[PDB]
Amino acid sequence: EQFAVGEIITDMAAAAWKVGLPIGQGFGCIYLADMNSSESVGSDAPCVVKVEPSDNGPLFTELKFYQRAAKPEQIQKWIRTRKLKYLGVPKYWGSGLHDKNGKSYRFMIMDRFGSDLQKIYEANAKRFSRKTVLQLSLRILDILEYIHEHEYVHGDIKASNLLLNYKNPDQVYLVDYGLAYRYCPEGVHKAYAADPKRCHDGTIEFTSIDAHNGVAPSRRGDLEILGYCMIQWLTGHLPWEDNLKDPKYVRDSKIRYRENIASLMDKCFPAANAPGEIAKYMETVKLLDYTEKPLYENLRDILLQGLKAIGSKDDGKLDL
Numbered sequence: 001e002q003f004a005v006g007e008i009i010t011d012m013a014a015a016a017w018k019v020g021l022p023i024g025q026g027f028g029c030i031y032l033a034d035m036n037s038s039e040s041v042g043s044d045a046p047c048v049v050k051v052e053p054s055d056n057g058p059l060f061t062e063l064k065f066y067q068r069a070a071k072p073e074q075i076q077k078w079i080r081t082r083k084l085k086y087l088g089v090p091k092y093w094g095s096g097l098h099d100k101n102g103k104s105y106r107f108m109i110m111d112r113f114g115s116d117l118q119k120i121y122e123a124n125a126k127r128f129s130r131k132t133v134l135q136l137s138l139r140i141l142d143i144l145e146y147i148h149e150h151e152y153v154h155g156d157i158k159a160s161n162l163l164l165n166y167k168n169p170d171q172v173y174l175v176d177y178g179l180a181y182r183y184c185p186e187g188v189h190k191a192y193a194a195d196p197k198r199c200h201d202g203t204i205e206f207t208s209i210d211a212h213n214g215v216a217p218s219r220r221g222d223l224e225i226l227g228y229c230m231i232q233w234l235t236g237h238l239p240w241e242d243n244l245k246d247p248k249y250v251r252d253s254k255i256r257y258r259e260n261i262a263s264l265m266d267k268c269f270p271a272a273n274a275p276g277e278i279a280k281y282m283e284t285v286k287l288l289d290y291t292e293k294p295l296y297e298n299l300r301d302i303l304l305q306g307l308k309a310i311g312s313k314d315d316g317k318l319d320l
């Protein structure tokens with residue numbers, strides 16, 4: 001156990017932080033945290049501290065993403081310029097080194113969040129409403145556009161990596177950048193082929209055809225993953241979920257259902273009850289080339305048409 005409840009840690013910018021109670025479930029070593037003060041760190045703490053040994057690969061990858069793309073002023077400038085209500089990218093508050101029993105450990109200070117969507121999804125009998133799925137997806141498209149414009153792809157979008165704002169249950173954030181991928185370092189897109197440094201293939205039921213083909217993740221892959229998430233949230237199932245131990249089967253089902261999206265709609269939704277925006281979204285992502293920049297605004301309009309169809313609008317209400 002890396003820290004004590006009430007321990008004061010100092011980051012590389014000489015900012016002092018006070019450690020609170022551990023909240024890391026089973027997953028990484030995470031404690032509640034706040035700015036150093038006379039008062040103890042409470043249950044309402046606005047930060048978390050993530051700790052791993054200095055030699056940990058994913059913490060270095062995650063730290064590099066947050067340092068490069070998630071500086072508080074970087075996010076706020078984007079929110080302002082793009083005229084967004086918020087941006088679901090967690091803010092980076094500091095990082096440092098800590099020693100315990102001779103060994104060296106790396107820590108990161110980040111935003112504290114509420115519940116993950118997987119818990120809420122399971123509590124709602126493995127279903128999310130059309131309104132909830134469209135509102136979630138509009139915000140995920142904002143997150144994905146931002147990280148893609150900052151040379152990164154997530155490659156592992158799912159309900160367990162989507163956490164609600166502790167103070168606002170209508171604001172969803174995308175977490176876990178330990179296996180995030182820098183697809184175009186210095187504006188140079190990675191060629192269609194395997195990356196020897198990368199070992200991860202995402203989460204089998206949601207991962208992209210590109211990842212299944214052993215190719216490094218790109219922008220179209222992240223949008224494809226979101227597509228599968230949308231179907232799973234709307235129906236409580238995916239056609240290939242009964243054979244997840246066999247990646248060959250999962251890739252085969254994905255390749256065949258990409259070739260015929262109408263058969264995917266017929267399989268997942270009751271006859272003539274399929275949401276048109278889901279099919280239109282899948283058809284648009286299908287048209288993307290490996291190195292192609294997505295037309296994010298066009299994908300947003302597709303989802304906005306779905307909200308208009310159900311007599312709603314983008315009011316930012318997640319209704320879950």
Ligand SMILES: N#CCc1ccc(Nc2nccc(Nc3cc(C4CC4)[nH]n3)n2)cc1
Binds near residue numbers: 027
């Ligand atoms: N344990 C566990 C699962 C889990 C593991 C890692 C992350 N990563 C991550 N990245 C950036 C910010 C942030 N904030 C949190 C995390 C938690 C609780 C303790 C889960 N609260 N606030 N978390 C989120 C959930």
